[PDB]
Amino acid sequence: LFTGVVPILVELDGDVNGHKFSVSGEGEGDATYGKLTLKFICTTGKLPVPWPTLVTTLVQCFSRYPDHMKRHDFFKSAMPEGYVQERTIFFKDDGNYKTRAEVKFEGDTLVNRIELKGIDFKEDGNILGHKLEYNYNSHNVYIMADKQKNGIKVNFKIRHNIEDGSVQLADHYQQNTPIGDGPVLLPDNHYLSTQSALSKDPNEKRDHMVLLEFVTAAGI
Amino acid sequence: LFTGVVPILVELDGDVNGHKFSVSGEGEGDATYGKLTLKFICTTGKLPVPWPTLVTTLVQCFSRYPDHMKRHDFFKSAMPEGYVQERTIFFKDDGNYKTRAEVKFEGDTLVNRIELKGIDFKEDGNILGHKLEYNYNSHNVYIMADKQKNGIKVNFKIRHNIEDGSVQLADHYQQNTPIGDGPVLLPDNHYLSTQSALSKDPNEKRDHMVLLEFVTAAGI
Q: How far apart are CA B181 and CA B179, in angstroms?
A: 7
How far apart are the C-alpha atoms of B161 and A138, rounded to whole Å? 8
d(CA B91, CA B174): 14
CB-based contacts of B130: which residues, under 8 Å, 6+ apart?
B50
Contacts by A99-102, CB closer than 8 A, 24 or more apart: A99/A57, A101/A57, A102/A179
3-state secondary structure of A61: helix
Experimental method: X-ray
The whole-angstrom separation of Cα B118 and Cα A171 is 39
Other beta carbons less than 10 A from residue A189's beta carbon: 12
Q: CA nearest A87: which of A173, A11, A192, A15?
A: A173
CATH topology of domain B1-220: Green Fluorescent Protein (2.40.155)
Q: CB A195 to CB B35 under 8 A?
A: no
Neighbouring residues of B100: CB distance < 8 A, sequence distance ≥ 6: B84, B85, B86, B114, B115
With CA atoms as reference, report the closest residue to B209 among B6, B10, B5, B7: B10
**Among the partner residues B136, B194, B199, nearest to A138 by beta-carbon distance:** B136
* CA–CA dist A220, A69 (Å, integer): 7
The three state secondary structure string of chain B is CCCCCEEEEEEEEEEECCEEEEEEEEEEEEHHHCEEEEEEECCCCCCCCCHHHHCCCCCHHHCECCHHHHHHCHHHHCCCCCEEEEEEEEECCCCEEEEEEEEEEECCEEEEEEEEEEECCCCCCCCCCCCECCCCCCEEEEEEEECCCCEEEEEEEEEEEECCCCEEEEEEEEEEEECCCCCCCCCCCEEEEEEEEEECCCCCCCCEEEEEEEEEEECC
**DSSP state for residue A186 in the 8-state scheme:** P
* Contact flag A135-B195 (C-beta cutoff 8 Å): yes
Instruction: Quickly count: other Cβ atoms within 10 Å of residue B128's Cβ.
Output: 19
Of B134, B163, B193, the CB nearest to A135: B193
Report CA torsion sign: B2, B3, B9, B11: positive
* Cα angle value A55/A38/B132 (rounded, 5°): 60
Cα(B64)–Cα(B70) distance, integer angstroms: 9
Length of chain A: 220
Name beta bridge partners: A152: A145, A176
d(CA B89, CA B96): 5
Neighbours of B18 (CB within 10 A): 7
A205: three-class secondary structure by DSSP: coil
**Cα–Cα distance list, B7 to B109, B114, B116, B179, B189 (Å):** 5, 17, 23, 20, 29
Strands A167-178 and A6-16: unpaired
In angstroms, how far is CA B25 from the centroid of its own chain? 12
Residue of A166, A214, A215, A216 to mutate, interface with B, max B Cβ within 10 Å: A214
Strand locations in A179-218, DSSP E? 190-199, 208-218
- B6-16 vs A208-218, strand pairing mode: unpaired
Which of B134, B137, B214 has the CB atom closest to A137's CB atom?
Answer: B137
Alpha-carbon distances of A9 from A53, A86, B115, B119, B216, rounded to whole Å: 19, 18, 46, 50, 29
| 8 A C-beta contact, residue B173 and residue B145 | no
For A143-183, the DSSP string reads: EEEETTTTEEEEEEEEEEEBTTS-EEEEEEEEEEEESSSS-
Contacts of range A126-130, beta carbons closer than 8 Å, 24 or more positions apart? A126/A91, A126/A94, A126/A160, A126/A162, A126/A168, A127/A49, A127/A50, A127/A53, A127/A91, A127/A94, A127/A95, A127/A168, A128/A16, A128/A17, A128/A48, A128/A49, A130/A50
Q: Cβ of A193 and B165 within 8 Å?
A: no
Q: Where are the domains of chain A?
A: 1-220
β pairing state of A190-199 and A139-146: antiparallel
Give the whole-angstrom CA distance, residue B186 versus residue A172.
44
Mapped onto helix, strand or coil, the DSSP state of residue A14 is: strand
Which of A190, A216, A198 has its CA nearest to residue A58?
A198
Q: Is A198 close to B214, i.e. CB distance below 8 A?
A: yes
Instruction: Give the whole-angstrom CA distance, residue B32 versus residue B10.
Output: 21
Helix (H) or strand (E) holding A32: none
Contact B104, B111 (CB under 8 A): yes
Beta bridge partners of residue A157, listed in sequence order: A171
Cβ contact, residue pair A202, B32, below 8 Å: yes
Nearest to A90, CA basis, from A145, A160, A10: A160
In a 3-state reduction of DSSP, which class is residue A192? strand
Please work out, in degrees rounded to the nearest 5, the angle formed at the alpha carbon of residue B162 by the alpha carbons of B161 and B166: 85
Q: Which residues of A touch B218 (CB under 8 A)?
A: 163
Cα A211 from Cα A39, distance rounded (Å): 6
For residue B138, which phi and psi values (nearest 5 degrees)?
A: -95, 145
